[PDB]
Structure formats: C-alpha cells, structure tokens
C-alpha cells in the first residue's frame, strides 16, 4: 500500500508501477490534482526540450555560425544578441510542431481521446533502434531519467549564468565562490 | 370587495381555504380533479387582498388569483 | 491528506478567497517589479 | 495632426512635474539623517519617480498642454500599445476564463452532483478544463459552425408578449 | 403516446417551465382536466417541481 | 472519412469530391453552419476580382495609358491620381454588374454558382468543363493570396511590385505609417 521510494506515504492511486520511470515518486499528491496521461506526456516533453538545450548550452560555447550576431558564449545573453526576427520563425515552426505531432488534440480534454495514443510516443523511430521489445522498455526509462537529469541541469545552467554571466565549461576551468 | 377567481388548473389541494384569515373560500364537489374537488369564493366581502391564497396555492401558474378591487372598512382592515 | 479537509478546501468560499489572493499578488508582484506601465512598451 | 499635443519629451510642462516633484521629496528627505530607515524610503520614491518620467520621454507617449500623457485609442499603429495591444491581452484572458468557465459548467451537468460541485468545485476536473483554455478562441469557432456554442430559440424559455 | 417515463416538451405559455423538457410521472385516468403530472429539475419562483398538463398543452420527445 | 489536405482531420461533411477546387479543406468547418452554394459563389466572385487586380496592379508598371494622369505605377497612389469622373464610371459598371449577381442568387438559385453563361469561345464547354472550373478555382485562390501581398506591400513601399523587387525593398522600414 506504501510509495517505493517515500516509504512512510500510501501509494498514490494513479501510480501503478506500470509507467517507465515509475517509483511512486508523488508525496504531494499531485498525480490526484492532473491527468496522469497528460503529467506523463508533459514530463517526457519537458525532459526532451532540456535535453536539447542542454547539448545546446555547451556547444554554443564553443561552436558558432558564421556573423558577430551569432557570437557570445554566454547562452542566456545569446537570446538576446541574435536576430528577434529569427526567433519568431522557431517560435512559429515549433507551433506546427506542436499542432501536426498531436493531430491538432493539444488540450487535456482532447490528447488522450485517442485510446491508441500513449505519452511521448509520436511514433518516431528512423533507424529503429527500439525494434527490440526488451530494449526499447529500457530504453523508455533511460529516457525519462537522461530528461529528468537534464532538466535540474538546465536549471543549473541558467542560474549559474544569472550569478556569474560565463559559460558552463568557463565557470568549471576558472570556478570563483560566492 | 376584491375579486377572488379560482380557475380550471385547481388540484383541489385545500391549502388556498387554510391559509385565508379571514374565511372567504371552501371546498365544494368536483369532477374535474383527482381529488374530486375545487377552491370556491362565496364570501369576498370579507376578502382583506393578503394574498396568503396565492402563496399556498401549487399550481403553475396559479389556480387562485385576487384582483384588489373597490376598498371598504373590511377590505382595508380597520378596527376604528 | 484527509479527504474532509479536502473536501472543506474545495468549498467556493475557500477557493474562492485562495484563488483571488493568488491573483492579486501576481498583480502586487508584477507592479512590484515592473513599476508604472501605462502602456506596452513596445 | 494632433497639433494640441506633443511629445512628453519635447514637453516644457511635463519636464517641470518632474523638477517640481523632485524638489518636494528633497525638502522631505532633508528633515530625515543619512542612512536612516525613513532617509533610503524618501531616496527609493525619488529614484522610482525619475525612473518614471524618463521612462515616458523615452517612449513617445503624447503629452497635452497640462503636461500629462494622453493616449489615442482610434486604431493607428504608432500608438498601438496604448490600447490595441492590451486589448487583445484582455480579450484573450477574459475569453480564457470565460470558455474554461462554460465548459465546466456543462460537464457537472453531465452528473449527479450538477449543484453540489457548483458550491464544492471538483477541482481536477476544474483544474483540466482551466488547463485547456490557451486555444479558446478556435475551440470557440468550431464549436460555433458544429452548432454546438448555441440552443435553438425554441428551446429555450420565455415568458408571454 | 404520452405514459410514465416519456419525456416532453412543455406548450403552455404562462408555465414557468413553457419550451423546456420534464419527465412524466403518471397519467390520471380520464374526466381528469389535466391529467399527465410532469417532474423538472428546476425549481419554479414557489420552490415547486411537479405540475400537472394537459395532452394539448405537452409533446412527446423521448419514448418510455 | 479523413480531410485529403489535412489527414488526422475528418473529412467536411457537406463538401464532396464532385465540387470544383475540392481538397477537402475546411478546418473551421463553415460548410457546416453557412449554405455551401453561397460560399461556393462567394468564393469564385473573390476569385474573379482578384485575378482582374493581381494582373491590374502589375500591367501599368509594363504599359499604361498615353498621360500624365494615368503615369503613377504605385496602384494606391494611381486611385488619388487618375480622373474622378473615370472612377465613376468604373464604380457604376461594378454596380451594374453587381445587381446582375443580386438578380442570379434571388430569382434564380437553380443556377450553378459562378455561372453567368459567359463562354464566347467554348473553352470550358465539353469535356474539359470539371479542369477548367478547377483551374479557374486554383488560379484565383493564387491571386486572392498574390492580393494580399500586393495590397499591404504597396502600403509599405509606395512602389509597384516589380519596382519593389528591382529595388530589392523586402525590408519594412516604413512601419508603423500612422
Ligand atoms: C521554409 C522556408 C524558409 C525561408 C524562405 C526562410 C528564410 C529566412 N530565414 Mg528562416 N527558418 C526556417 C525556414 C525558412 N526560412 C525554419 C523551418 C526555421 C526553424 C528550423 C528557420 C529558422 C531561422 C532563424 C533562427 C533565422 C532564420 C532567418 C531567415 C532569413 C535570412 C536567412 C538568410 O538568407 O541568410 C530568411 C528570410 C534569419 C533571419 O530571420 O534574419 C534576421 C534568422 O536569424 N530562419
Ligand atoms: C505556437 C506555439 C506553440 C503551441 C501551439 C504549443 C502547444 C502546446 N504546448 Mg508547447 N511549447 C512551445 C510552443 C507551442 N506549444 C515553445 C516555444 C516551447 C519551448 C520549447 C514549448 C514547450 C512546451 C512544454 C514544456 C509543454 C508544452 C505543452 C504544449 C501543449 C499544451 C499547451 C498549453 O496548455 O499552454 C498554455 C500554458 C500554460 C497552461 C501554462 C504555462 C505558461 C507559460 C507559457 C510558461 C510557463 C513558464 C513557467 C516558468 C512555468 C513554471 C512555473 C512554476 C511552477 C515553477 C500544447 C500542445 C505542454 C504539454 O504537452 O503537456 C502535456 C507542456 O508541458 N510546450
Ligand atoms: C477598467 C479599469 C482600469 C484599467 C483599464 C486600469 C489600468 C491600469 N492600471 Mg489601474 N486602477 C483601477 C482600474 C483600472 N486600471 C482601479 C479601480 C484602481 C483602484 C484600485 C486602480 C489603481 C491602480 C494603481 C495604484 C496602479 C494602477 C495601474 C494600472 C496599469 C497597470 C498595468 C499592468 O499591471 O500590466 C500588466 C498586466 C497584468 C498584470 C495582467 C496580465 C496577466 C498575466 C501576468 C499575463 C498572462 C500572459 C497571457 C494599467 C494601465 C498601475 C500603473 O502603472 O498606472 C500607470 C498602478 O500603479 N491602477
Ligand atoms: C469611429 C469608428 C472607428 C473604427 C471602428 C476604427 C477602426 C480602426 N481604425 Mg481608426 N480612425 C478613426 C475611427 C475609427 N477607426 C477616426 C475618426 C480616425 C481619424 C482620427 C482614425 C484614424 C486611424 C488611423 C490613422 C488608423 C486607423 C486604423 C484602424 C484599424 C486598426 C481599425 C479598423 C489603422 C489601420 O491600419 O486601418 C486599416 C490606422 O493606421 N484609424
Ligand atoms: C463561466 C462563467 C460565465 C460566462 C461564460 C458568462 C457569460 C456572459 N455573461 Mg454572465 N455572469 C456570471 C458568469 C458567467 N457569465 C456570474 C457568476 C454572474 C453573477 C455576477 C454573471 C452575471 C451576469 C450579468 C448581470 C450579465 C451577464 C452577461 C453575460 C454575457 C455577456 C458578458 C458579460 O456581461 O459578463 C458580465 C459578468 C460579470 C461581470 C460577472 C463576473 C463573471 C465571473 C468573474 C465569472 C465567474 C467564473 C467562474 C467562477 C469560473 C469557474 C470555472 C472553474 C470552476 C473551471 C455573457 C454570455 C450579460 C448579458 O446577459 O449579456 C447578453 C449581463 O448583463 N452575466
Ligand atoms: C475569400 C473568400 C473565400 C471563400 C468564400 C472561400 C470558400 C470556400 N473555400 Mg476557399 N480558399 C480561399 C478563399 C475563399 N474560399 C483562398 C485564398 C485559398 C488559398 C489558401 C482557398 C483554398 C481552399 C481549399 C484548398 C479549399 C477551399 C474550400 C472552400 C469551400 C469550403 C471552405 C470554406 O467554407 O471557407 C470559408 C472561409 C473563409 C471565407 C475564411 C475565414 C475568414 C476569417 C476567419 C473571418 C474574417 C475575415 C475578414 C476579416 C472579413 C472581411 C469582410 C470584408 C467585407 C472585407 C468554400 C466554398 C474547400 C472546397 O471544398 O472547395 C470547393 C477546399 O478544399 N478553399
Ligand atoms: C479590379 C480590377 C481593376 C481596377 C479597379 C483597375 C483600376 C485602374 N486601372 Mg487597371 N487594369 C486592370 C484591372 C483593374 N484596373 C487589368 C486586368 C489590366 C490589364 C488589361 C489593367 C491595365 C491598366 C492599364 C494599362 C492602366 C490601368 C489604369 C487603372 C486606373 C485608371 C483608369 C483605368 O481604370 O484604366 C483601365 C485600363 C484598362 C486597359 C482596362 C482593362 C479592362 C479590364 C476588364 C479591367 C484605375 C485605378 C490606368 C492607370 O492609371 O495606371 C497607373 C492605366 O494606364 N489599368
Ligand atoms: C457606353 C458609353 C460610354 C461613353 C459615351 C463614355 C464616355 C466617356 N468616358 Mg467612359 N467608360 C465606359 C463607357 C462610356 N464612356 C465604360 C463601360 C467604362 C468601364 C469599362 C468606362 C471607363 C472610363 C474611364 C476610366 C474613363 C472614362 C472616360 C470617359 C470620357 C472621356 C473620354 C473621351 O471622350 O476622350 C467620356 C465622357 C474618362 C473620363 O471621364 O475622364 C475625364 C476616363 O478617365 N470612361
Ligand atoms: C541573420 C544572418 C544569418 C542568417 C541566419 C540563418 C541562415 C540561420 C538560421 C538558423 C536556423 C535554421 C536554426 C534553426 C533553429 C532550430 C531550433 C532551435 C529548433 C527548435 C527545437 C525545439 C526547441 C523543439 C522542442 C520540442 C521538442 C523537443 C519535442 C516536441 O514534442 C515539442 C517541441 C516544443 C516542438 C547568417 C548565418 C547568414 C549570419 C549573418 O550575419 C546574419
Ligand atoms: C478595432 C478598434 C476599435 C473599434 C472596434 C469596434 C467597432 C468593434 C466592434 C465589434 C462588434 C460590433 C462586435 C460584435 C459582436 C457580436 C456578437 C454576437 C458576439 C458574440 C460573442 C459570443 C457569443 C461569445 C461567447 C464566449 C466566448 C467566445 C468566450 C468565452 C465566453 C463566451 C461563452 C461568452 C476602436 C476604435 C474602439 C479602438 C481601436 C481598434
Ligand atoms: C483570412 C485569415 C487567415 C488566417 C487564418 C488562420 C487560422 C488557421 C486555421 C488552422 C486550423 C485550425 O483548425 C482547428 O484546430 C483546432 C485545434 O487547434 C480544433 O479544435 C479542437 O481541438 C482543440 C484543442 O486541440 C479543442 O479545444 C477544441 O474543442 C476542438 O474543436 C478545431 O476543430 C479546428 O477547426
């Protein structure tokens, strides 16, 4: 009846044990407030999105396109030295995204009205790498920690920024306290 | 006097004849109701215009209704 | 949580007063914090 | 045109709110010592205050000839955030809480406790239809050619004419 | 027919009720002047749920 | 049962392959609530005066009338420019035409829409009727696009469209104009 890995909390009733990443991880019962389905899909979603800026906020340290526009190393000061007229057409594009990958079901009402759709699973796969049943099951809850782990990274990251104004590596290579 | 009507809709409930204070209505034989009965007004010269039948009455809309008329010392309740 | 204390924090009144607070102190916060916008600045 | 206002910037009357302003919070700030509490109080109103009017000047915002900014609300773009645009944040909020609102609304109506969970709110059943109010106005729409936003006037009641 | 279970829409104008859908409860036999008692989830101004109609002044929209 | 243009979307349910310009596109669904003959008119008389001023905005740039009234190559400059007396007439002609439409859609709905009986040479008139309806929909649904373009461009530049282009004018520096 207990969490696995709050062991002095009844188990949330949502929480099965079922779901990738599952250790009845929910002491303030939150899974009872919100749609598990769509707490999943937004979790996955969350952890995907950090994944990228994650990559993102180091290689940007060091590799560049071509322009002073395109210059700083610093990734939060980048956002706003590059042209705002490019990050209306991200902004936009992501919009298609959003509205073709869901089949124009974007709401909690509507995602999972669909019995076949499942959370995270846009069915994308081109070099098949889940073919295998057994690994793919694995590999769904690699992919829900490496988000998770990325998503406290990314939060790091920002805030790190926000204190010192350097890049990721430039604050490890010359580390100054508070 | 007031005018008192009771209309065709009337269940024959008797609630209008217990309100009224002043003893304007009774029941008489009917066969238009399951109760076999209907609200009459044979004594609205004692009729004060409270309006206590109305609010009684369960019908939608209502099957007892007072049209407030020609005053009187009655009507207007005066003890002097 | 106990289900009646639940129950009794659904109430309008309740959530009412919680969701209102909530909303005036974003108000609060962000003249706190952005002070005097007469107009989108643009 | 608007040639009875100027530019807040350009603005002899709206420069001497300033230093008349100012010159007040001086004389209030000089009965106080340096450093005390009610002294940094009086400094922060007249850092707040400068921030304010030079925020204005900078803006091109139109001043009258009280020396006060006035706003023009007829459609033209160059003055599209004074009006415009927080129009259209106020509709799309407004129009937000509005359709989350009716659609829980008809779900509870859809259930035994239609009036119980009007006075007692579910609250994730709330909370589901507050989440999905970001596409109200497409929703709207839609709903509106299904024939699903409006009853029939013959199904709704009225009373004699 | 209207009986026990049908659902109707109300046609006397002066109902509270006049264009909206009640449930039947019973049908009174006959000499009755308004023998079908029809149930409303609203309350009426009095607080009432229940009326009685005649067969001209209800229609029938669901069977039972 | 699926919308052609967009597949995770439901076919309209009052449009058929049969109609011209058919892509089963209607997202909003307006086929559902308004009458789709009246669209289908409604659409085609856009269609029609789009294409007469995609071409009209573009010929003067190429050739106009021997003048100096009729010289101005900006077409909403042109209007300000050219005789009143010669709008007037243009506006009645657009009145006469329209009382035309009003008398086809109220006396006489049998009619198919777009249709006034004007084929002087039989270009659409055998077995080329279901193309020819087609292309003038797609046609005109370029044009109704194209007019966009031109209209809110010229409000921008003063220009023509070629001139705009041959100048290399892509860039609003002219916004906001009041
Ligand atoms: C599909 C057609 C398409 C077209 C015609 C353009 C055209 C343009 N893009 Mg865009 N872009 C596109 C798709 C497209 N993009 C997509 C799908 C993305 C997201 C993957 C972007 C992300 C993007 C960024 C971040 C930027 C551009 C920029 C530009 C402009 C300058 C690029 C150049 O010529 O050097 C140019 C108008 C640049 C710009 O807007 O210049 C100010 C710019 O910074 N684009
Ligand atoms: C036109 C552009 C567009 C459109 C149509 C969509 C559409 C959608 N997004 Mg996407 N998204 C977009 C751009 C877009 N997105 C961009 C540019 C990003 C950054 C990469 C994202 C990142 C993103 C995330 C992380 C998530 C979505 C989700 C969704 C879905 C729910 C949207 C919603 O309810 O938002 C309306 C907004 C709210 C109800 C509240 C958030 C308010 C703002 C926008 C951001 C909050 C920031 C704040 C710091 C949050 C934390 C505060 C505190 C608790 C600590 C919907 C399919 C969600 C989803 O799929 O869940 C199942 C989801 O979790 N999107
Ligand atoms: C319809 C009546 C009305 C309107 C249109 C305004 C409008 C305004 N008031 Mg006034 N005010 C009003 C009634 C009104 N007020 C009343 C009745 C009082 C007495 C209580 C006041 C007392 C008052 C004071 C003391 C102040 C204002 C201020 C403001 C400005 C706030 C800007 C802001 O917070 O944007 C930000 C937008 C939001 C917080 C809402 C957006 C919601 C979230 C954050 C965004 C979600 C994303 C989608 C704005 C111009 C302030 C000002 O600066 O004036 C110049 C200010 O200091 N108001
Ligand atoms: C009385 C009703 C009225 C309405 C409904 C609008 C509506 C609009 N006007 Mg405004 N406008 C008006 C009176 C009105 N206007 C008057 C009297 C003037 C002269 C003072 C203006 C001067 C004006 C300018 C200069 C502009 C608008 C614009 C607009 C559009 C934004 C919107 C369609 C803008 C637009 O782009 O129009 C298409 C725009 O640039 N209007
Ligand atoms: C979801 C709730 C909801 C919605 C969609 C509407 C919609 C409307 N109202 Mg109604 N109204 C409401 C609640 C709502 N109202 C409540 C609670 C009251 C009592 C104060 C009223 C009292 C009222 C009056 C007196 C009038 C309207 C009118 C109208 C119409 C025009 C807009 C207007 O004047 O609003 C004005 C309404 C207000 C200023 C009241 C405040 C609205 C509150 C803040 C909304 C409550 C939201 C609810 C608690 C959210 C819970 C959702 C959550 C559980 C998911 C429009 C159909 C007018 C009309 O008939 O035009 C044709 C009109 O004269 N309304
Ligand atoms: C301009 C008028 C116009 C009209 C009346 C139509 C009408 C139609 N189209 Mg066509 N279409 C148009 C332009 C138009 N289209 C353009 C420019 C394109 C190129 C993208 C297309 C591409 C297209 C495809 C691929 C298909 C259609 C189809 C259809 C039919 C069903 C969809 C519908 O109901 O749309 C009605 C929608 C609108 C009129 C747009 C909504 C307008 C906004 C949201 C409201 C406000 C607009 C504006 C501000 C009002 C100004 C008023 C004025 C006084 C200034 C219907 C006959 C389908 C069909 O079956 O063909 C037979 C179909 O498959 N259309
Ligand atoms: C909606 C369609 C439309 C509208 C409102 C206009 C309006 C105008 N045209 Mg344009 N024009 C059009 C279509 C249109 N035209 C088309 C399809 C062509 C190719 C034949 C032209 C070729 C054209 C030329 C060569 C000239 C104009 C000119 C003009 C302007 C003044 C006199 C005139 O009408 O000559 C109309 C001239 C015609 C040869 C009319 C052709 C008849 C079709 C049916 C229209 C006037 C603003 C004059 C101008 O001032 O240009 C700057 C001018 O010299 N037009
Ligand atoms: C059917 C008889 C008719 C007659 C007698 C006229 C006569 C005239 N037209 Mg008109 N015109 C006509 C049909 C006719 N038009 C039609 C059907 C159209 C629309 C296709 C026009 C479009 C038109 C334009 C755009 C202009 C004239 C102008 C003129 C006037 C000067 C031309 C000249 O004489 O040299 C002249 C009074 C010109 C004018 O009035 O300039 C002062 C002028 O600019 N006409
Ligand atoms: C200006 C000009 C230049 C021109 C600039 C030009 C050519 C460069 C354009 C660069 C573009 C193509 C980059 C594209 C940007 C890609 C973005 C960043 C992708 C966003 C992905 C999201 C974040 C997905 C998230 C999500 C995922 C993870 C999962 C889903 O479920 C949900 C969503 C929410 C969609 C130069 C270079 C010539 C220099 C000169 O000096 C000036
Ligand atoms: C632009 C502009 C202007 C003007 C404007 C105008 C003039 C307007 C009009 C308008 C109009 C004339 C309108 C109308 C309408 C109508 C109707 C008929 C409506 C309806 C609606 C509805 C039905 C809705 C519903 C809903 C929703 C959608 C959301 C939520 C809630 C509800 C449910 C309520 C000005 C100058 C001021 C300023 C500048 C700009
Ligand atoms: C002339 C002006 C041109 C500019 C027009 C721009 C608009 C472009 C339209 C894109 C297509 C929108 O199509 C519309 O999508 C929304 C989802 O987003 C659908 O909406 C559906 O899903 C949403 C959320 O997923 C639900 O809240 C809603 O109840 C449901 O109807 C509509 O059923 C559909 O009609």
Same mark, same amino acid.
């Given at each position: 009846?207990?969490?696995?890995?709050?062991?002095?909390?009844?188990?949330?009733?949502?929480?099965?044990?079922?779901?990738? +990443?599952?250790?009845?991880?929910?002491?303030?019962?939150?899974?009872?407030?919100?749609?598990?389905?769509?707490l999943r899909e937004s979790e996955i979603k969350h952890g995907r999105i950090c994944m990228l800026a994650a990559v993102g906020f180091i290689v940007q340290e060091f590799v560049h396109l071509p322009g002073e526009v395109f210059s700083n190393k610093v990734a939060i000061d980048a956002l706003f030295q590059v042209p705002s007229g490019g990050l209306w057409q991200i902004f936009l594009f992501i919009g298609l995204l959003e509205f073709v990958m869901n089949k124009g079901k974007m709401t909690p009402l509507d995602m999972?009205?669909?019995?076949?759709?499942?959370?995270?699973?846009? +069915?994308?796969?081109?070099? +098949?790498?889940?073919?295998?049943?057994?690994?793919?099951?694995?590999?769904?809850?690699?992919?829900?920690?490496? +988000?998770?782990?990325? #998503?406290?990274?990314?939060?790091?990251?920002?805030?790190? #920024?926000?204190?010192?104004?350097?890049?990721?590596?430039?604050?490890?290579?010359?580390?100054?306290?508070? | 006097?007031?005018?008192?009507?009771?209309?065709?809709?009337?269940?024959?409930?008797?609630?209008? $004849?217990?309100?009224?204070?002043?003893?304007?209505?009774?029941? $008489?034989?009917?066969?238009?109701?399951?109760?076999?009965?209907?609200?009459?007004?044979?004594?609205?010269?004692?009729?004060?215009?409270?309006?206590?039948?109305?609010?009684?009455?369960?019908?939608?809309?209502?099957?007892?209704?007072?049209?407030?008329?020609?005053?009187?010392?009655?009507?207007?309740?005066?003890?002097? | 949580?106990?289900?009646? =204390? =639940?129950?009794?924090?659904?109430?309008?009144?309740? =959530?009412?007063?919680?969701?209102?607070?909530?909303?005036?102190?974003?108000?609060?916060?962000?003249?706190? =914090?952005?002070?005097?916008?007469?107009?989108?600045?643009? | 045109? *608007?040639?009875?206002?100027?530019?807040?910037?350009?603005?002899?009357?709206?420069?001497?709110?300033?230093?008349?302003?100012?010159?007040?919070?001086?004389?209030?700030?000089?009965?106080?010592?340096?450093?005390?509490?009610?002294?940094?109080?009086?400094?922060?109103?007249?850092?707040?205050?400068?921030?304010? *009017?030079?925020?204005?000047?900078?803006?091109?915002?139109?001043?009258?000839?009280?020396?006060?900014?006035?706003?023009?609300?007829?459609?033209?773009?160059?003055?599209?955030?004074?009006?415009?645009?927080?129009? !259209? !944040?106020?509709?799309?909020?407004?129009?937000?809480?509005?359709?989350?609102?009716?659609?829980?609304?008809?779900?509870?109506?859809?259930?035994?406790?239609?009036?119980?969970?009007?006075?007692?709110?579910?609250?994730?059943?709330?909370?589901? *239809?507050?989440?999905?109010?970001?596409?109200?106005?497409?929703?709207?729409?839609?709903?509106?050619?299904?024939?699903? !936003? !409006?009853?029939?006037?013959?199904?709704?009641?009225?009373?004699?004419? | 027919?209207?009986?026990?279970?049908?659902?109707?829409?109300?046609?006397?104008?002066?109902? @509270?009720? @006049?264009?909206?859908?009640?449930?039947?409860?019973?049908?009174?036999?006959?000499?009755?002047? @308004? &023998?079908?008692?029809?149930?409303?989830?609203?309350?009426? @101004?009095?607080?009432?749920?229940?009326?009685?109609?005649?067969?001209?002044?209800?229609?029938?929209?669901?069977? &039972? | 049962?699926?919308?052609?243009?967009?597949?995770?979307?439901?076919?309209? %349910?009052?449009?058929?392959?049969?109609?011209?310009?058919?892509?089963?596109?209607?997202?909003?669904?307006?086929?559902?609530?308004?009458?789709?003959?009246?669209?289908?008119?409604?659409?085609?008389?856009?269609?029609?005066?789009?294409?007469?001023? %995609?071409?009209?905005?573009?010929?003067?740039?190429?050739?106009?009338?021997?003048?100096?009234?009729?010289?101005?190559?900006?077409?909403?400059?042109?209007?300000?420019?050219?005789?009143?007396?010669?709008?007037?007439?243009?506006?009645?002609?657009?009145?006469?035409?329209? %009382?035309?439409?009003?008398?086809?859609?109220?006396?006489?709905?049998?009619?198919?829409?777009?249709?006034?009986?004007?084929?002087?040479?039989?270009?659409?008139?055998?077995?080329?009727?279901?193309?020819?309806?087609?292309?003038?929909?797609?046609?005109?649904?370029?044009?109704?696009?194209?007019?966009? %373009?031109?209209?809110?461009?010229?409000?921008?530049?003063?220009?023509?469209?070629?001139?705009?282009?041959?100048?290399?004018?892509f860039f609003p520096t002219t916004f906001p104009l009041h």
């Amino acid at each position: 009846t207990k969490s696995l890995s709050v062991p002095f909390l009844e188990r949330p009733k949502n929480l099965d044990g079922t779901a990738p +990443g599952d250790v009845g991880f929910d002491p303030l019962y939150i899974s009872d407030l919100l749609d598990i389905q769509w707490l999943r899909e937004s979790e996955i979603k969350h952890g995907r999105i950090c994944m990228l800026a994650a990559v993102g906020f180091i290689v940007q340290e060091f590799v560049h396109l071509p322009g002073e526009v395109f210059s700083n190393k610093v990734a939060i000061d980048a956002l706003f030295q590059v042209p705002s007229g490019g990050l209306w057409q991200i902004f936009l594009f992501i919009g298609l995204l959003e509205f073709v990958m869901n089949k124009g079901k974007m709401t909690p009402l509507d995602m999972f009205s669909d019995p076949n759709r499942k959370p995270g699973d846009f +069915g994308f796969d081109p070099l +098949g790498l889940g073919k295998d049943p057994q690994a793919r099951k694995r590999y769904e809850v690699a992919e829900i920690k490496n +988000g998770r782990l990325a #998503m406290l990274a990314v939060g790091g990251f920002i805030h790190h #920024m926000l204190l010192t104004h350097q890049g990721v590596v430039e604050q490890l290579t010359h580390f100054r306290s508070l | 006097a007031h005018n008192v009507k009771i209309y065709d809709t009337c269940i024959g409930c008797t609630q209008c $004849v217990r309100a009224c204070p002043c003893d304007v209505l009774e029941m $008489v034989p009917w066969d238009g109701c399951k109760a076999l009965q209907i609200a009459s007004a044979p004594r609205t010269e004692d009729c004060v215009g409270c309006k206590r039948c109305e609010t009684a009455c369960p019908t939608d809309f209502l099957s007892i209704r007072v049209y407030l008329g020609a005053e009187t010392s009655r009507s207007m309740g005066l003890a002097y | 949580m106990n289900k009646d =204390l =639940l129950k009794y924090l659904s109430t309008a009144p309740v =959530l009412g007063v919680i969701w209102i607070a909530i909303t005036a102190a974003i108000i609060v916060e962000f003249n706190r =914090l952005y002070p005097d916008a007469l107009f989108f600045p643009l | 045109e *608007f040639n009875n206002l100027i530019p807040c910037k350009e603005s002899k009357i709206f420069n001497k709110r300033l230093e008349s302003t100012i010159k007040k919070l001086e004389n209030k700030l000089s009965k106080y010592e340096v450093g005390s509490s009610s002294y940094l109080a009086i400094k922060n109103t007249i850092n707040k205050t400068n921030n304010r *009017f030079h925020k204005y000047m900078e803006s091109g915002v139109l001043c009258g000839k009280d020396g006060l900014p006035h706003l023009i609300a007829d459609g033209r773009w160059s003055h599209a955030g004074e009006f415009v645009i927080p129009s !259209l !944040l106020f509709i799309y909020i407004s129009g937000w809480i509005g359709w989350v609102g009716r659609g829980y609304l008809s779900a509870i109506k859809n259930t035994n406790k239609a009036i119980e969970n009007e006075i007692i709110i579910d609250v994730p059943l709330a909370l589901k *239809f507050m989440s999905s109010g970001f596409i109200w106005p497409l929703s709207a729409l839609r709903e509106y050619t299904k024939g699903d !936003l !409006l009853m029939k006037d013959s199904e709704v009641t009225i009373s004699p004419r | 027919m209207v009986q026990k279970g049908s659902k109707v829409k109300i046609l006397r104008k002066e109902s @509270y009720w @006049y264009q909206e859908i009640g449930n039947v409860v019973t049908v009174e036999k006959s000499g009755i002047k @308004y &023998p079908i008692i029809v149930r409303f989830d609203k309350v009426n @101004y009095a607080g009432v749920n229940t009326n009685n109609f005649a067969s001209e002044e209800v229609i029938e929209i669901e069977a &039972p | 049962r699926m919308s052609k243009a967009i597949p995770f979307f439901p076919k309209p %349910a009052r449009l058929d392959e049969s109609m011209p310009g058919y892509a089963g596109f209607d997202p909003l669904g307006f086929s559902d609530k308004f009458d789709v003959k009246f669209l289908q008119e409604a659409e085609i008389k856009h269609c029609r005066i789009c294409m007469l001023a %995609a071409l009209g905005w573009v010929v003067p740039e190429f050739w106009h009338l021997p003048s100096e009234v009729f010289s101005n190559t900006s077409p909403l400059a042109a209007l300000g420019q050219v005789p009143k007396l010669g709008l007037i007439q243009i506006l009645l002609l657009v009145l006469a035409l329209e %009382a035309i439409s009003l008398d086809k859609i109220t006396f006489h709905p049998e009619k198919e829409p777009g249709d006034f009986g004007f084929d002087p040479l039989g270009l659409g008139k055998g077995n080329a009727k279901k193309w020819m309806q087609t292309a003038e929909l797609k046609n005109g649904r370029l044009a109704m696009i194209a007019m966009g %373009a031109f209209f809110h461009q010229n409000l921008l530049t003063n220009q023509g469209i070629f001139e705009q282009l041959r100048t290399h004018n892509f860039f609003p520096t002219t916004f906001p104009l009041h």
